[PDB]
Paper text:
To evaluate metal-ion affinity and to identify protein metal-binding sites for Sr2+ and Cs+, a class C β-[name] ([name]) [name] [name] the moderate halophile [name] (HaBLA; molecular weight 39 536) was chosen as a model system. The crystal structure of a halophilic β-[name] [name] [name] (HaBLA) was determined to resolutions of between 1.8 and 2.9 Å in space group P31 using X-ray crystallography. Seven binding sites (site 1 to site 7) for divalent metal ions (Ca2+ and/or Sr2+) and one binding site (site 8) for Cs+ per HaBLA molecule were identified by X-ray diffraction studies including anomalous dispersion.
The solvent content in the NQ-HaBLA crystal is 43.0%. The crystallization of WT-HaBLA and NQ-HaBLA required divalent metal ions (Mg2+ or Ca2+). Both WT-HaBLA and NQ-HaBLA crystallized isomorphously, and both contained three HaBLA molecules in the asymmetric unit. The binding sites for Na+ were not identified in any of the measured HaBLA crystals because of its similar electron density to the O atom in water.
Author numbering: 8 to 364
Amino acid sequence: QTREVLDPIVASLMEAQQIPGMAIALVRPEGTTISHYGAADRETGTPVDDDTLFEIGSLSKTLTATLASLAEVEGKLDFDAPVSRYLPELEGSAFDDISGLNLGTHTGGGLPLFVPDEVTDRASLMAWYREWQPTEPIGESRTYSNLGIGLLGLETAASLDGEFVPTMRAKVLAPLGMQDTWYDVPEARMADYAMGEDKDGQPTRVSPGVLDDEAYGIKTTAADLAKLVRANLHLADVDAELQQAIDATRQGHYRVGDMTQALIWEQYSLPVAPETLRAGQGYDMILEPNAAEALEPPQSPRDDVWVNKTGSTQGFGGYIVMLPGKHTGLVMLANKNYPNDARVEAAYRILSGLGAI
Ligand SMILES: [Ca+2]
Ligand SMILES: [Ca+2]
Ligand SMILES: [Ca+2]
Ligand SMILES: [Ca+2]
Ligand SMILES: [Ca+2]
Ligand SMILES: [Cl-]
């Protein structure tokens, strides 16, 4: 059916990219279709199924954004306020001049991509933030930053008077029914935890690290990510405040060339060419500063857009696409870090084959 469109495209993709296993969710009005392909671990051959956990890498950032947005809806976090208003340990630093919004849109003054090696824990991280000098004009330049979205998670946790993961669990994951979503995979689920395969065909699994939970640490199922997508598409029955928080994550905040930066979510007006999508996931967007123009007639969530986010670790590659105007979404998780361009092509062919574009 829907499977007749999906199955050949994923077979072709997994063959071409030598991906051991995939889990895919297709979200539409009148329902969600879950499909599993291949092996969760190439070296045991254990199949991908309902319980298989995939590393989603930077897709974790969408959950971080959602929690921040919920704190904002609850009146506990002001997105345009200086981050030092909620983390007074950073008073007198650059974070007097950088907001939660800047952090959620990668416009925090050129804040760098990676946590530096001299930062090993929360104390050394805060010391590093206190000393750091902005290298770009705050709110006028975008640099993709684990440090920034990480700090947004810490700011959110402070504003909610709780710790990041328990707070995430209580306020976002549990209400969405995301009960297969883990920051630290329990012993009892280790048999479900897919093994990654890197670009050389070697097994690999993500290591813990500072700001891991906020930036890249989730292991989850396609089905759980589909719940977050369903809610984004107004197809879920969720509490009003959570729904509002989720809707606000899709508000466009900056124009960045052809891309609109929402709260972590990245979006494009329809029709969108795949080449534009590809440009969004390459060196020039991800590894250079890009000029960013605040959207000052501040836009409402749009119904005529391609909304997306990639996520990877060394051994995994995930992609989410949402088409709010079609009430359709796609979640693709793989245990190989395969090229972003191939993620775009496969998503586009699936969605075109389904008539959604
Ligand atoms: Ca304000
Ligand atoms: Ca390092
Ligand atoms: Ca952690
Ligand atoms: Ca204004
Ligand atoms: Ca092609
Ligand atoms: Cl990092």
